[PDB]
A and B are shown apart, each in its own frame.
Chain A
Amino acid sequence: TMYIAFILSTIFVIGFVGFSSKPSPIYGGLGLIVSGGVGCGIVLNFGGSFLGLMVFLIYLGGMLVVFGYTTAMATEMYPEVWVSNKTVFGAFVSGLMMEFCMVYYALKEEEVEIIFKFNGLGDWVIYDTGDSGFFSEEAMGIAALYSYGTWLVIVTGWSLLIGVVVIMEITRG
């Protein structure tokens, strides 16, 4: 249980391979669902309760609208799964093999340098020994968006409104 985060990250990579091999978008949907849930688990394990629950909630809602479209636009008479096409299965197997090879190389060989230098020790090491007191530091920093980040709020709100406008202009013919 000292490597829970590593297991969750491996499942993250597995889900990314799953929806990266491009099965039917319906199946890519559950691939992204698993990846998002496991990423929420990782963020929870690192202390980001609100942030992890936030990715979980948003992607859960977003993939629903994708599913609606998969049944409206990307609907193939015979939707394809990871074991339906040799191309999709090949991509899935290649991704799994890459992940397994890198995991094995990282674990059995403590110091691994593929592109960056990765250390094989557990993720628990990098944790800090400080005390936050009566705080949820992530929550306070996030809530500082309305006090410190007024400019960020303005720009994000304007972008969302312009996004609504752009969607309406695009989907008008």
Chain B
Amino acid sequence: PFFDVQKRLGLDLDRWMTIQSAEQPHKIPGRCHAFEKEWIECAHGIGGIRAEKECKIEFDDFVECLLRQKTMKRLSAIKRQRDKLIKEGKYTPPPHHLGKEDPRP
């Protein structure tokens, strides 16, 4: 029994902290503000059953932003391949990646 007294009386007791895309002090954006905004605007009013399957690309992008599991997997694959290449001497890291060139300001 979700007695939604907040929506009835118009009070805002806890809906201000339910999402990171809501208003935050000094307009400090969330790390995944864009993805959550897209997911919420996609899945607004169509119901939970439709939102699960229809706005699934947006939710997948949001999850990837939140956890970076696939990005970390790609980076780990790159690191492993680079280590394997270095072991066999098939690759030489560039000087800007070896701390030899001054990074741009």
Interface residues of B in 63-88 (CB under 8 A from A): 68-69, 72-73, 75-76, 79-80
* B25 near A141: Cβ-Cβ < 8 Å: yes
Bound: A89/B97 CA distance, A: 49
**B contact residues around A137 at 8 Å (CB):** 28
Q: Per-position contact with B for A129-149: 1 when CB-CB < 8 Å, else 0?
A: 010100101001101100111
| Residue A110 CB within 8 A of the other chain | yes
* A121 near B68: Cβ-Cβ < 8 Å: no
A-B contact count (CB 8 A): 41
* B26 near A140: Cβ-Cβ < 8 Å: yes
* B76 near A140: Cβ-Cβ < 8 Å: no
Q: Report the nearest A residue to B72, measured CB to CB.
A: A119
Bound: A149/B18 CA distance, A: 12
* A117 near B69: Cβ-Cβ < 8 Å: yes
| Residue A151 CB within 8 A of the other chain | yes
Q: Report the nearest B residue to A150, measured CB to CB.
A: B13
**A contact residues around B73 at 8 Å (CB):** 111, 119
Bound: A111/B80 CA distance, A: 12
Q: Per-position contact with B for A78-121: 1 when CB-CB < 8 Å, else 0?
A: 00000000000000000000000000000000110000010111
* B80 near A110: Cβ-Cβ < 8 Å: yes
* A144 near B25: Cβ-Cβ < 8 Å: yes
**B contact residues around A119 at 8 Å (CB):** 69, 72-73, 76
* B75 near A121: Cβ-Cβ < 8 Å: yes
Interface size on A, residues (CB 8 A): 21
Which of B26, B68, B72, B75 meets A135, CB within 8 Å?
B26
* A111 near B76: Cβ-Cβ < 8 Å: yes
* B28 near A135: Cβ-Cβ < 8 Å: yes
* B17 near A149: Cβ-Cβ < 8 Å: yes
* A125 near B13: Cβ-Cβ < 8 Å: no
| Residue B31 CB within 8 A of the other chain | yes
Q: How far is the CB of A22 from chain B (nearest CB, A)?
A: 35
Bound: A140/B79 CA distance, A: 37
**B contact residues around A111 at 8 Å (CB):** 73, 76
**A contact residues around B14 at 8 Å (CB):** 151
**B contact residues around A147 at 8 Å (CB):** 25
* B72 near A125: Cβ-Cβ < 8 Å: yes
Interface residues of A in 142-171 (CB under 8 A from B): 143-144, 147-149, 151
**A contact residues around B28 at 8 Å (CB):** 132, 135, 137, 140-141
Q: Which 9 A-B residue pairings sit nearest by Cβ, starting from the closest?
A: A151-B13, A144-B25, A119-B72, A140-B25, A110-B76, A121-B76, A128-B31, A137-B28, A121-B72
